[PDB]
Design a protein around this ligand. Structure first.
Ligand SMILES: CCCCCCCCCCCCCCCCCC(=O)OC[C@H](COP(=O)([O-])OCC(O)COP(=O)([O-])OC[C@@H](COC(=O)CCCCCCCCCCCCCCCCC)OC(=O)CCCCCCCCCCCCCCCCC)OC(=O)CCCCCCCCCCCCCCCCC
Ligand SMILES: CCCCCCCCCCCCCCCCCC(=O)OC[C@H](COP(=O)([O-])OCC(O)COP(=O)([O-])OC[C@@H](COC(=O)CCCCCCCCCCCCCCCCC)OC(=O)CCCCCCCCCCCCCCCCC)OC(=O)CCCCCCCCCCCCCCCCC
Ligand SMILES: CCCCCCCCCCCCCCCCCC(=O)OC[C@H](COP(=O)(O)OCCN)OC(=O)CCCCCCCCCCCCCCCCC
Ligand SMILES: CCCCCCCCCCCCCCCCCC(=O)OC[C@H](COP(=O)(O)OCCN)OC(=O)CCCCCCCCCCCCCCCCC
Ligand SMILES: CCCCCCCCCCCCCCCCCC(=O)OC[C@H](COP(=O)(O)OCCN)OC(=O)CCCCCCCCCCCCCCCCC
Ligand SMILES: CCCCCCCCCCCCCCCCCC(=O)OC[C@H](COP(=O)(O)OCCN)OC(=O)CCCCCCCCCCCCCCCCC
Ligand SMILES: CCCCCCCCCCCCCCCCCC(=O)OC[C@H](COP(=O)(O)OCCN)OC(=O)CCCCCCCCCCCCCCCCC
Ligand SMILES: CCCCCCCCCCCCCCCCCC(=O)OC[C@H](COP(=O)(O)OCCN)OC(=O)CCCCCCCCCCCCCCCCC
Lengths: 334, 334
């Protein structure tokens, strides 16, 4: 098979075993809540930017199958649009733009670097190594295109909090794009593109070892920090909250993969049936990825719903592992 | 040359650039002192034991050049003995045993995993890959032989701090060995040897990914933590304190490499002049390695000299980089 089903279980074992190590360390107070920030800061501000820069300068932008990127972008945009309109119609007038901003983000952007990358690395290294670069192209552009709309919706909600005649339409759009630019992923991707043009895709050997050393520690540290941040997050809550969680996680893990697959079918025109099928199966896998903790960080930053997002973030992690195993097994069975 | 001098400067750039990143993060309060413990716990309690286990189970104890190992431990023991007797003769009656316990440990135990391993990996990968395993054999055995004596001396100092007729010599030896056993580098090495025999040097593929994901995040994170703990450490001491610092750092970085080279000259019979020369150059390099932060941790645990060991630990790092560069150039010029 194009995707190695036999290597899928060891990769899942690695990822959720590091997550379990972090979870047990937090539960036993080996690493406390305050001490968790140091690992979080290192992995998000040093380990992730170095990896992003190294994978952005090296990337051959000319030899990129933009059809996969367009298909996944339109699938995510369609899911964003559907979730936004449904929430705006059904949510309580008190807070609709908050949900219509964060819920579509919850259901579209996923754990692509910490957890998504190891799975793609395991399944798509000896067959399709090009599939690894789409992790570093889909996610930054997804945060650069859909996240501005959600942040604008959250700023609109904050504006209803401070009711006034001054709409501040320019400021509302200004704040929404500013938060996207402030995120390390986006501006490190911009700098990586810049230095891909300046350095002509050749990172100097004087900084090669430094970049590898700072970027080879991301995967394990990010998985450990993910496990460490799940301590005391899943709490009992109302059954209306439970059903909206079920709908959101379903939209993320079944609806989003199916939509990604169908727009890949519509957009990707490949000479071979085999490579098109494998790319559609990858697009199915991209979406089985659980909700990124960045969504929880955004919810904490805006402080609008830090229980609906965080709980669904942790739960989708425990649902993604069975679904990804079941899906690929069902996708390698024929 | 046997060692790649052209690759030495990029390795130093990587190591001390991650150290500089950690230092600047600590100086700018990006990662605070309390937050640093979370990264410290991740490397010492999770990242280092996984790497030690993976490198202990895989290691083939049969194909090991014990001559280098014997030479280096005999050199470190000779330096330990010399420093111990000199300190016992010259130090003030008040704290002879504390200095005679920690100063010989300062001048023999070096940073072999965080800092030593990347350098040896850079200079001894395409030529002498066997040189990397000695890092994981010298350091544990050095910690299991010389460190017990130093801990016994510190327990003697603590005993005279609690002067009583019951010298409890059995307890003094018991605590000295117990501290070594409690160290992860020791009991993880024992477990790795045990599973090297049980698993016949074959780690299961199920846990290979987990171990290689938790152990590939050590070097960068450990260098970052070394830089992070360096903030606010170098402080002005007295002239006597400065001269004992100079003597200790010289014993560590010039005397110890020279003695190691001598024991390699004597206790090593090699078919080729070239391999013996390269291995003696390695033994010179081992000793140019700065004082391990574990020595400072031991000093903090015993709380006798937390300003003499720690300052010399930081200073030896900034002296090891010029010395290793100069020494490798001087060892590759002929
Ligand atoms: C071999 C030896 C070499 C190695 C030697 C050592 C290496 C250098 C070490 C220096 C740093 C070490 C210690 C860090 C602290 C010191 C200062 C600092 O960085 O503060 C960060 C500061 C720490 O404070 P904090 O309170 O903990 O964090 C708050 C956050 O900023 C939360 O955000 P906020 O709300 O507070 O917003 C503020 C933030 C928001 O950020 C901004 O506003 C800046 C970005 C805005 C947009 C920029 C895009 C520009 C586009 C250009 C063209 C693109 C084309 C497309 C155009 C777009 C059209 C669509 O701006 C800041 O003030 C912080 C960022 C500083 C400027 C960022 C840009 C450069 C830094 C990135 C690293 C180097 C890049 C390569 C440079 C090569 C030549 C020097 O914030 C961050 O951590 C920022 C996020 C991550 C950035 C990097 C941080 C450390 C960098 C070192 C490791 C990364 C690897 C480097 C890659 C390649 C380098 C070779
Ligand atoms: C693919 C999926 C698979 C992955 C799934 C998840 C993996 C498992 C995760 C479990 C742990 C996650 C969260 C950690 C916290 C939970 C409990 C815990 O471990 O607490 C540690 C506990 C945390 O508390 P703390 O207050 O922050 O630290 C205090 C320190 O212990 C400071 O020392 P102290 O003064 O407080 O002394 C107390 C310490 C002192 O330690 C002792 O007294 C124990 C050692 C004494 C001597 C043992 C030598 C035995 C020699 C046998 C034969 C050798 C032949 C030669 C004979 C000698 C003759 C010369 O004893 C303890 O209570 C702590 C150590 C616990 C037992 C250590 C032995 C086993 C654990 C090591 C990892 C697994 C090994 C492979 C096992 C394979 C089958 C299960 O301390 C440590 O961190 C200990 C140091 C490092 C040990 C490992 C810690 C986490 C292990 C997970 C990552 C390591 C990689 C595993 C390698 C291979 C595994 C496949
Ligand atoms: C049910 C499905 C999930 C679990 C699958 C099976 C897990 C087996 C774990 C075996 C680990 C052996 C290590 C020692 C564990 C026992 C001692 C310990 O530290 O307890 C862990 C914790 C209780 O901690 P506590 O008792 O508060 O503090 C410790 C001192 N008493 O006890 C716990 O709460 C352990 C964690 C259980 C729930 C974890 C859910 C999130 C973890 C990430 C996803 C699942 C990853 C694990 C499964 C896949 C493995 C790759
Ligand atoms: C509008 C709302 C937001 C939508 C965002 C959609 C993604 C935008 C990303 C930036 C632009 C990427 C596309 C630029 C190429 C020109 C248009 C195109 O798609 O042509 C692709 C062409 C290959 O020919 P074709 O058959 O068309 O492609 C089939 C795909 N396998 O290939 C080429 O012509 C390649 C030539 C250019 C190669 C270097 C490109 C570097 C600059 C892009 C870096 C990333 C910037 C991201 C910005 C996104 C902003 C939202
Ligand atoms: C173009 C017009 C199209 C119109 C279509 C017809 C109407 C919609 C039919 C399909 C509905 C699908 C989603 C069902 C959502 C149910 C939510 C729920 O049970 O809680 C909502 C409730 C708010 O109050 P409610 O009971 O809705 O009272 C009426 C409001 N005036 O509880 C609350 O207070 C919580 C509010 C939060 C609601 C969040 C909604 C999230 C939606 C997730 C959708 C997932 C994907 C669905 C689409 C799949 C196919 C692409
Ligand atoms: C003199 C020899 C050592 C230094 C060699 C040259 C270092 C050049 C550094 C360039 C780094 C550029 C990044 C931005 C630095 C300027 C802004 C900053 O954050 O300052 C760093 C620090 C002052 O921090 P502070 O001002 O308190 O807080 C920041 C906000 N004002 O300023 C400092 O104190 C910086 C650290 C200087 C001393 C570091 C000594 C230990 C570092 C590890 C060993 C040396 C590693 C560097 C050399 C080799 C590089 C691989
Ligand atoms: C006195 C104070 C303590 C001194 C400590 C010094 C280091 C001790 C480390 C453990 C024992 C290692 C030596 C065991 C081998 C028997 C003696 C020996 O050195 O023989 C080496 C022999 C090769 O033949 P030869 O020519 O003698 O070696 C030349 C070196 N290139 O090769 C062989 O015979 C190899 C056969 C055995 C291979 C498996 C060994 C596994 C067990 C050791 C694991 C490490 C345990 C460390 C314990 C240290 C305790 C302080
Ligand atoms: C069999 C007989 C052999 C006789 C050989 C010759 C005798 C030795 C001659 C040289 C002596 C050098 C002494 C260096 C220290 C000078 C200060 C001193 O002696 O005072 C004792 C000092 C007092 O304590 P202190 O805290 O410094 O002062 C009180 C106020 N703060 O105490 C201290 O705290 C400092 C004690 C010094 C600790 C370090 C000593 C060893 C340093 C490494 C030496 C490496 C090179 C040795 C030769 C290698 C050969 C292979």
């Amino acid at each position: 098979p194009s995707m190695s089903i036999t290597r899928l279980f060891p990769a899942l074992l690695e990822c959720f075993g590091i997550v379990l190590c972090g979870y047990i360390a937090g539960r036993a107070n080996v690493i406390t809540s305050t001490q968790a920030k140091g690992l979080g800061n290192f992995v998000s501000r040093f380990a992730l930017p170095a990896l992003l820069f190294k994978n952005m300068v090296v990337l051959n932008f000319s030899n990129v199958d933009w059809s996969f990127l367009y298909s996944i972008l339109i699938a995510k945009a369609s899911v964003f649009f559907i979730v936004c309109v449904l929430t705006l119609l059904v949510a309580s007038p008190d807070s609709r733009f908050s949900k219509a901003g964060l819920f579509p983000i919850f259901a579209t952007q996923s754990n692509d670097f910490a957890l998504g990358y190891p799975i793609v690395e395991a399944l798509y290294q000896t067959t399709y190594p090009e599939y690894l670069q789409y992790i570093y192209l889909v996610a930054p552009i997804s945060l650069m295109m859909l996240n501005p709309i959600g942040f604008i919706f959250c700023e609109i909600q904050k504006w209803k909090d401070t009711q006034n005649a001054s709409q501040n339409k320019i400021k509302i759009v200004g704040l929404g794009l500013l938060r996207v630019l402030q995120n390390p992923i986006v501006f490190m991707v911009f700098i990586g593109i810049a230095f891909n043009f300046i350095l002509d895709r050749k990172v100097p050997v004087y900084v090669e070892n430094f970049l590898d050393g700072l970027g080879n520690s991301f995967s394990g540290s990010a998985l450990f920090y993910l496990g460490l941040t799940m301590v005391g997050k899943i709490k009992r809550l109302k059954k209306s909250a439970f059903v909206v969680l079920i709908l959101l996680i379903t939209a993320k893990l079944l609806v989003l993969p199916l939509l990604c697959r169908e727009m890949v079918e519509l957009l990707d025109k490949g000479d071979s049936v085999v490579n098109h099928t494998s790319l559609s199966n990858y697009a199915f896998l991209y979406g089985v990825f659980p909700v990124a903790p960045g969504v929880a960080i955004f919810a904490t930053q805006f402080n609008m719903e830090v229980e609906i997002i965080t709980s669904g973030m942790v739960i989708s992690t425990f649902v993604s592992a069975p679904i990804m195993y079941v899906s690929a097994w069902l996708l390698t069975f024929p």
